[PDB]
Amino acid sequence: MGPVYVSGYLALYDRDGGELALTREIVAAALPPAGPLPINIDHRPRCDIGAVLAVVDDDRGPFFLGVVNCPQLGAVLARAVGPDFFGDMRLSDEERLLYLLSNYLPSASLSSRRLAPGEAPDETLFAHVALCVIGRRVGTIVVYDASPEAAVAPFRQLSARARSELLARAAESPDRERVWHMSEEALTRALLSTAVNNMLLRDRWELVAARRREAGVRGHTYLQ
Amino acid sequence: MGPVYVSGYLALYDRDGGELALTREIVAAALPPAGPLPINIDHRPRCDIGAVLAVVDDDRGPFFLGVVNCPQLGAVLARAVGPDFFGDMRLSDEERLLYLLSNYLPSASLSSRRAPDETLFAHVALCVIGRRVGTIVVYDASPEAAVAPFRQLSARARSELLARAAESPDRERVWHMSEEALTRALLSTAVNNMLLRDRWELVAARRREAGVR
Ligand SMILES: *P(=O)(OC(C)C)OC(C)C
Ligand SMILES: *P(=O)(OC(C)C)OC(C)C
Ligand SMILES: [Cl-]
Ligand SMILES: [Cl-]
Ligand SMILES: [Cl-]
Ligand SMILES: [Mg+2]
């Protein structure tokens, strides 16, 4: 086991309706987070598997870089797949993990505190980032990779400024070398929860492709 | 935890290709299965949650009725659903299990061994998509309700099915399983199906094939 990195937009300005929309003003008030934001699975409490290392206010929206480093995750995922799942392919442990995570949890969801009537946004606003199948906000696909620079590279419209600032802030996060241990039983439950809550979702792979387009990540072709 | 009943066609005559196709003669020789047919999740060993109570040779294909009686199954599925999934509904624990099973494991898959006789059929695995045409299942609180939605199931076959199932020795059994093992089996179902495209279209087609409305 070693750590893996995850990144993407947490929202895109002007791209959501109503209650979901995150405005430039809210994001400016919310950053930097008052404490580090954890990364959990499907908003479940007690199943943190990483932490956001940096959030940047890019021109198109707030963009994050996270680390996921739960030793048991690879084990639980590998035990779940049938014996001939990867066929003839030879892959490292790290690459199987990346493949399964990428496809089991291809999106992110930023969760915020519910503010009271007339309570102003501040740095306590953002609570956590949940990995999920489809986020409710436009363009909230994630990329996972074995290093931070590779995790962020696919986002073609991320500005260079914001990219540099992001990578710099992340390189000095307290959470950068942390490890999140969980029992296998707890992790298994957390992953099953994602499946059960998303079982009814229609057209999930077209929705994933749409999120990818919205984010500016080169679309996955399936024509060969 | 009263038991769960499950039913459906194990195959339809004249509808599968080659390796999957079951003929009438072969089916007639295979019934009645000469020992009880376990019900499991995805053909997994050490993962029995039920048994087939009867199979009948309906005009359209072999049709089964089973009982699933595994206390831990209800608990594992119910823990998994997020706190808003049922809206402002209040479901009983049994109605919730029925719903979640219905949608988590909507199909069945009959496995055999390799002259043909009553030992041929081995077990029935619950799954997301069965390889054979029309292998949807219905789950419900009684055998009557479990078989009701199959419009094309013959009255004769339905009556023979319900009567044999009412006499089955397995009808009151219980299958205690560890929550840990169950949670693994269910997670395996999700990971092995995660990449499946248009799953609910394939299920709707299975349903139409079985003659469910
Ligand atoms: P998120 O996108 O939710 C935030 C709007 C709180 O995740 C969904 C899939 C529940
Ligand atoms: P079943 O339909 O397979 C029988 C033909 C053994 O299960 C599939 C999903 C493998
Ligand atoms: Cl009849
Ligand atoms: Cl799909
Ligand atoms: Cl679908
Ligand atoms: Mg009913």
Residue numbers in the entry:
A (entry chain B): 1 to 224
B (entry chain A): 1 to 114, 120 to 218
What does the paper say about this structure?
Here, we report crystal structure analyses of the active dimer, the diisopropyl phosphate-inhibited dimer as well as the non-inhibited monomer of pUL26N from PrV (224 amino-acid residues). The tertiary structure of pUL26N is a β-barrel consisting of a four-stranded antiparallel and a three-stranded mixed β-sheet surrounded by eight α-helices.
In our inhibitor complex, covalent binding of diisopropyl fluorophosphate has formed a phosphate ester with the active-site serine in a manner also observed in crystal structures of homologous assemblins. The native and inhibited dimeric structures of pUL26N are nearly identical with an r.m.s. deviation of 0.39 Å (437 aligned Cα atoms, secondary-structure matching) over the whole dimer. The quaternary structure is a homodimer related by a two-fold non-crystallographic axis with an interface area of 1,273 Å2 (native dimer) and 1,258 Å2 (inhibited dimer) comparable to all previously published structures (~1,300 Å2, determined by PDBePISA). Moreover, native and inhibited dimers of PrV pUL26N crystallized isomorphously and the diisopropyl phosphate-ester of the active-site serine is quantitatively observed in the inhibited structure. Thus, the catalytic site of PrV pUL26N remains fully reactive with respect to this substrate-like inhibitor. A putative cation was found in both dimeric structures from PrV. Presumably, the presence of putative Mg2+ ions in the structures is a direct result of the crystallization conditions (containing 400 mM MgCl2) and does not reflect functional Mg2+ binding by the native protein since the metal ions compensate negative charges from two adjacent dimers, rather than within one dimer.
